[PDB]
Design a protein around this ligand. Structure first.
Ligand code: HEM
Length: 153
């Protein structure tokens, strides 16, 4: 469980993401694909994109980044009370996309990297801690729902 303080830190930095959701979403996906190129295969959509520049020009990648962050944002704003938001996400990701928990770790690392790159002044150790805990909670809960659905990823 996070403390109220911890949630406030998460949501304060998240308000900065919300100033430019698309641009944050692009940076996060590109960082994920750069750092762990195997994930780009579990994205048949724009898995063909060959340079950083093509990635930044892709309207389809940009739109997806907004869809990912909007869903994560809605989850974080529930401060742990996220069953109704998380269940459908687990369903899709376990049964259709087949995304292992390790890939949720990879994108969590990308989120943290981009938040610190863009907002160092609102993303010091205490804020990093808090966001790390929120993303851990998300992954723990999603993994439990994966298992319920019969997916051990
Ligand atoms: C913070 C983590 C994540 C969030 C919040 C998230 C959210 C979403 C959302 C909302 C959708 C569209 C609705 C749905 O199909 O569920 C989506 C689709 C998808 N996600 Fe994720 N996702 C996350 C992580 C990942 C990772 C790490 C991968 C692959 C490495 C992945 C692969 C996909 C794919 C393949 C689709 C289908 C897209 C399409 O065909 O248009 N997701 N995700």
């Amino acid at each position: 469980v996070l403390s109220e303080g911890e949630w406030q830190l998460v949501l304060h930095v998240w308000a900065k993401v919300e100033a430019d959701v698309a641009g944050h979403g692009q940076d996060i996906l590109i960082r994920l694909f750069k750092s762990h190129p195997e994930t780009l295969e579990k994205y048949d959509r724009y898995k063909h994109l060959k340079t950083e520049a093509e990635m930044k020009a892709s309207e389809d990648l940009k739109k997806h980044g907004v869809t990912v962050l909007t869903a994560l944002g809605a989850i974080l704003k529930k401060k742990g009370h996220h069953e109704a938001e998380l269940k459908p996400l687990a369903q899709s990701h376990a049964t259709k996309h087949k995304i292992p928990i390790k890939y949720l770790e990879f994108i969590s690392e990308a989120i943290i990297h981009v938040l610190h790159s863009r907002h160092p002044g609102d993303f010091g150790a205490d804020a990093q801690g808090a966001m790390n805990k929120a993303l851990e909670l998300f992954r723990k809960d999603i993994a439990a729902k994966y298992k319920e659905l019969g997916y051990q990823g």
